[PDB]
Design an enzyme around this catalytic site. Structure first.
Site, mmCIF file in Angstrom:
data_model
loop_
_atom_site.group_PDB
_atom_site.id
_atom_site.type_symbol
_atom_site.label_atom_id
_atom_site.label_comp_id
_atom_site.label_asym_id
_atom_site.label_seq_id
_atom_site.Cartn_x
_atom_site.Cartn_y
_atom_site.Cartn_z
ATOM 1 C CG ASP A 35 82.579 -102.287 86.324
ATOM 2 O OD1 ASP A 35 82.761 -103.486 86.062
ATOM 3 O OD2 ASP A 35 83.104 -101.692 87.277
ATOM 4 C CB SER A 199 84.902 -121.727 83.992
ATOM 5 O OG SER A 199 85.325 -122.316 82.772
#
Length: 330
Positions: A35, A199
């Site tokens: 994770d 992004s």
């Protein structure tokens, strides 16, 4: 040194990925959920409340000759999905695909929430976020990657998750045969303890690419792709019959649909998520309504590039002095 282990989807929908981890002496092998959105290595154990164990493999510290109780240490974690676990702490030897850390904090669960009990395929979590998020009290502990870093050939690990197929976690090296083209590296903020990046925008299917900054985290521990409501609405608007369902808790769509792809930007580079990666199957057994793999982050507070996004790419988690993230198509 390096390490390399195969990671496998837990079910036919890629709901999560498990990777075998050796703990203790002699080794006890548990399948952990790696994770990059958390920083605790915790395990089902001989100390876990018996009614809360249902098929998981447990770590028994009393049978490990190298296990040492970390005096006075406890841990307690609550995840974004509403699940939780807590317990005490041992240090022990931990190995992942041939890479060994002695003295790793192994957080032994006394209590787990219902969703962990109900998932017999996940024996615990191995956190790969930044150690500032580790929950051990009163002395915070280091992640497996943080402990292994100095010994690694390169201070990196890579995630290459498969779509309906096995994939790989590598530590210490970049497999240049595992991706096409080049890796584009992008800046990371560690201010919230995550592999947080921006992004450069998105496209839906064959549509025009929209340049827009989307700040979010690379999170191997989250199944889906969580993005701003404007972006998610633009995606599902291309799927005939899709709609946001309050009772289901997100966007659903007719199981007979063929989904468009979703592209996200990494600098000037583009990662294309194939449409089928966005199909998470009937909302309930036998239903012809299917759950979408791209959902709104509006109630979360942070965008999450989960498995839906990451499995479309070869992802470099670069733990250099200034950390960065690398993405390549594959």
């Amino acid at each position: 040194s390096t390490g390399s282990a195969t990671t496998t989807p837990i079910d036919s929908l890629d709901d999560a990925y498990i990777t075998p981890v050796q703990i203790g002496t002699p080794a006890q092998t548990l399948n952990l959920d790696f994770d990059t959105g958390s920083s605790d290595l915790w395990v089902f154990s001989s100390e876990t409340t018996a009614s809360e164990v249902d098929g998981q493999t447990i770590y028994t510290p009393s049978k490990s000759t190298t296990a040492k109780l970390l005096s006075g240490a406890t841990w307690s974690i609550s995840y974004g999905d509403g699940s939780s676990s807590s317990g005490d702490v041992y240090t022990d030897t931990v190995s992942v695909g041939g890479l060994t850390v002695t003295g790793q904090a192994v957080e032994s669960a006394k209590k787990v929430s219902s969703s962990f009990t109900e998932d017999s395929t996940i024996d615990g979590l191995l956190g790969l976020a930044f150690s500032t998020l580790n929950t051990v009290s009163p002395t915070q502990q280091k992640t497996f990657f943080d402990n292994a870093k100095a010994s690694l050939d390169s201070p990196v690990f890579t995630a290459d998750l498969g779509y309906h197929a096995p994939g790989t976690y590598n530590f210490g090296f970049i497999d240049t045969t595992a991706y096409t083209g080049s890796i584009t590296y992008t800046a990371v903020s560690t201010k919230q303890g995550f592999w947080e990046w921006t992004s450069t925008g998105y496209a839906v299917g064959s549509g025009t690419f929209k340049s827009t900054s989307i700040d979010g985290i690379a999170d191997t521990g989250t199944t889906l792709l969580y993005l701003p409501a404007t972006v998610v609405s633009a995606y599902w608007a291309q799927v005939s019959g899709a709609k946001s369902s309050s009772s289901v808790g997100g966007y659903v769509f007719p199981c007979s649909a063929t989904l468009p792809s979703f592209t996200f930007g990494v600098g000037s580079a583009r990662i294309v998520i194939p449409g089928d990666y966005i199909d998470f199957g009937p909302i309930s057994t036998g239903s012809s309504s299917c759950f979408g793999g791209i959902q709104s982050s509006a109630g979360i507070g942070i965008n999450i590039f989960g498995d839906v996004a990451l499995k479309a790419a070869f992802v470099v988690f670069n733990g250099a002095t200034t950390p960065t993230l690398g993405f390549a198509s594959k």
